[PDB]
Amino acid sequence: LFHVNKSGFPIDSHTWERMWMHVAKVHPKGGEMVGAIRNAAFLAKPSIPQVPNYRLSMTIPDWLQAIQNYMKTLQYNHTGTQFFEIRKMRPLSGLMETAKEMTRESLPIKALEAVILGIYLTNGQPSIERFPISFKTYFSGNYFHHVVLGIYCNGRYGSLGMSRRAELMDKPLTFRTLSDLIFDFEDSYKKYLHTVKKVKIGLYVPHEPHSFQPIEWKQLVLNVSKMLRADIRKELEKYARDMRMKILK
Amino acid sequence: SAQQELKQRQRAEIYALNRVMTELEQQQ
Amino acid sequence: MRECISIHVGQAGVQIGNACWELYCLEHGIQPDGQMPDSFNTFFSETGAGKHVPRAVFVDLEPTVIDEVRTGTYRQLFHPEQLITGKEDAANNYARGHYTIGKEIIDLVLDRIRKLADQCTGLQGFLVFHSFGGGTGSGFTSLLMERLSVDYGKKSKLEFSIYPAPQVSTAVVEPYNSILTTHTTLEHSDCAFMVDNEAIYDICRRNLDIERPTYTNLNRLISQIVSSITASLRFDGALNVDLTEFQTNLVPYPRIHFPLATYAPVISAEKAYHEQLSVAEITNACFEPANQMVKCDPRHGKYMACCLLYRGDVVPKDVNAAIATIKTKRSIQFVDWCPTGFKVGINYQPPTVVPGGDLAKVQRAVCMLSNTTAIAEAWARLDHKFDLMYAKRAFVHWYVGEGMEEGEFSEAREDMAALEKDYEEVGVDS
Amino acid sequence: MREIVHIQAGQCGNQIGAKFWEVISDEHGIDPTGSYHGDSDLQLERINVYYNEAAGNKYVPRAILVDLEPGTMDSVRSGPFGQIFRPDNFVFGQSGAGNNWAKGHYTEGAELVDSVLDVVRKESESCDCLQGFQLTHSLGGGTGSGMGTLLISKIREEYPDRIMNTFSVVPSPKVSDTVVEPYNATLSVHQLVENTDETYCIDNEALYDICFRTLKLTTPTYGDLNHLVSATMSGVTTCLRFPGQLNADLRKLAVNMVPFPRLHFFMPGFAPLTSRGSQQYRALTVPELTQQMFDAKNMMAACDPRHGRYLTVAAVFRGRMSMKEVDEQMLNVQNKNSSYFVEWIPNNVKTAVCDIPPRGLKMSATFIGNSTAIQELFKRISEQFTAMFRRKAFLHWYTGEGMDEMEFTEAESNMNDLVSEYQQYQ
């Protein structure tokens, strides 16, 4: 499994050599390009993507699109080594500090820190409202998990996130219902012959950055595979109504 | 002084390496 | 043969000490003039003819509060030399209290400490009372604690401070004082018990049903907690816990010794009749978030170690039962590296109620101390305050004009960041 | 200990100071013969702040009186509570300044400055712990505007470590009884910025509006305005003399309210001000006092607080009152009016509470604000200055006293500098 940087910055010797051993092992050709990049005297300096700023004139779907293209520009991590250690139960303010230092450094990003970045970017807009979604799925005799960030601006459901695949990480605000969104995710997942087993939905995140409220991820959980989609849709629409009225607590 | 150059080198090499493995995943 | 001496600095410290010594004189039966009409030995010295002298040192750079005590109803209690006074206040300035105006008085107090600690045989520690926001309670406490730490290396010192509240405040330069005092409170003291005014205001408004409480009520509550802490030294019970025992039980690592206190049952004389107030009830009342005397929610943290000082009519089986029901609850989250996290202590003397105050004459009460990780919020907010002002260099010229150096402002901030980081990195799983 | 020296210059300063001494003496229970006929012991406890004991167990104010026209001393000694001052503290000139700044600072003001420094020095060694000085004067003149600045400059040379508290009355545009106000005003505030720690600007227009609209007076003479100013002055220095739940002397206010060294010009307030007819239709509670303090119509300087933010605020309450009431009131007052307060100062109110209210009330509160709206006044003065200085009107009189012309340009430059500095934080 992919390992996590924990020495702050810069990267310590142990994690450095561990990552290089990992990439040497997995890469079939292996040592040639690895050693070439190690002993490369000069390499092209990557540019710094500029953090976009909210503007009132331009519309909110284009805002979500803009954050999505910036995230795409940030070169999604497939090196197999996390660079910013995240804790689920940690209070929100620590995650805001993590998000702002991550934007300062602008390194490769995975799904969890991608949705944290999305929360950090969208925290400035009371009209926009966002929450997490998680899937636990089954394929090839092993279980895998994925996480994305849903949005409910202007009475419409949309999705942001990251993945090595293309269509599993970005949807627009064009969904009347949350059920249509999650079933679209299920169909895209089936397109790769991966079976979703369980689906989990949390809560709207508070709009105050400097707070200690933790992020909820398990407030709703279903076993999607066993049950027929009608009951799933009914329970999900009940839950969406319970959420947008702020009743759940 | 040299610390910032170290971060520069680190991000440059890791960016290039990530490009290489993205190409490999395209191969896969 | 078991003692501790009390130092009250600044207006807040002196005013809390007023209530504290009222309470202690009430508990042991000492008249206001110090004449009784051997459990008093912890706080009082007998000097022939039954005269009782508190082991207190009242200090303030400004003479008005000390003069108020000199003219008050306890003029005959303290002997006159203890009440030390300056000429002009620190004026909410750390640099005046520490460097400029503190130098002229510090020797005159230190020797007095050297006198008092030379009268006792066995001494357990010090009970310092101060406030973070003030210029006296910060700078003068810094100087005094530095001098004592270099003097008595291995005597525990217990600060009982008053941390600034998040929203309620009565000064413009509080963050600069608190951040500067964070260096002395760490690394010199042994157990600092933070307290807010907003939390106790809420407690008095809700539990006691008082719409217009003033500082006297807050001082009475804090006095009750301190008298509960220093109770196993004066009376006897099933389990006894002196200073060093609960110091070893609480402080896991040397650099995190900031517990937050609690008390129960706080109820008015009218609601007492409709209440049973058993051991289980009061034990459960300590853990709800609406009773913490620091404006922070303990539900967003974990308890490292806890200490439940019971007093009154209690027996250990009830305490074990209550601790069991607490451990069953999943809302109250403890830390994995502390499988047992309760230091129990029972005492036979019940609480005492001052006649002029407003608290029910209950039969048993518990004081709960918790070394929880939720305290960092109470710090974090204040750092933000500092960050908003120091960015513009606002008010810095007042501090640098009194000989203070500017780099200390950034050094204190990075020290506080290190403290918060260390406090957060523990409590992680495994 | 922590004593204060009080100095009065000009007719306006002398009259306001006479009213101030009458108010202070009444508050402490001092007879106009100087004897004591009070009731409590708190009155004697800190009487040395403003008084010196004398043989026969009487008390003499620690006050110095100066003018260049002996009529003002005659009126002051004749008037009520004029006998308490000892005669040797009065000093007078031969001929008044004639509203000439250069005359009261260079020509005839120098020939009398030595006596005032001598008596001030003699009074400053009649104590042990001196907190600071305080001076009442008017910027629109020659005897208060020039001699006053000369005096504070000399004293600040002598005692760099103390504080000064100038309660200056600024000239108003509409209520003007003089033709050469801008020249004197600018020439004085050139020197007030550097040699003073707290300047409380007062305007006659705002005072007249307070008497007409709030107190519903028909014919407000100068006595009523002087009474209001005296009430403010007595409110400022109350924590030095009486005990309270949260004390605050002069230096505490200075450090709380002066974020930067040059931004030390304040405009005070006062509450409760109620007419005789509307006495019984009010509850006299802390919310009422706080609402009346922050009212735009309650400011003592003719400026609109809505046209600018508050850097820092202070409020010295007076009476037996809860602290939760005060804290919640000065919290929600900031909550509702977030637009009127500066964002880069998290807390803008330095609240203090005393226990002994004024004689005829149960509760009072002296409001002192440091807003960016004060510079309005200065711009108006600058306009009038550049209206007259362009054509060199009335200017030969000042040059005839040995004053040079470039000083006017320098003072105008300082005026633009200070106004820009206040404009910056907005």
Ligand SMILES: Nc1nc2c(ncn2[C@@H]2O[C@H](COP(=O)(O)CP(=O)(O)OP(=O)(O)O)[C@@H](O)[C@H]2O)c(=O)[nH]1
């Ligand atoms: N609130 C008050 N304002 C006053 C009072 N007297 C004057 N003022 C104002 O002061 C302004 C001028 O004050 P002064 O007469 O003292 C000028 P000064 O005497 O210092 O110079 P000389 O006349 O040359 O002696 C005048 O425009 C009035 O509007 C007063 O008694 N109370």
Ligand SMILES: Nc1nc2c(ncn2[C@@H]2O[C@H](COP(=O)(O)OP(=O)(O)OP(=O)(O)O)[C@@H](O)[C@H]2O)c(=O)[nH]1
């Ligand atoms: N609980 C409680 N807090 C108080 C009391 N008096 C003052 N405070 C707190 O003290 C803080 C201000 O600091 P002070 O202690 O008054 O400063 P100081 O010790 O007098 O030192 P100086 O400023 O130099 O006079 C305020 O924020 C109050 O919350 C009191 O009687 N009880």
Ligand SMILES: [Mg+2]
């Ligand atoms: Mg004080």
Ligand SMILES: [Mg+2]
């Ligand atoms: Mg005159």
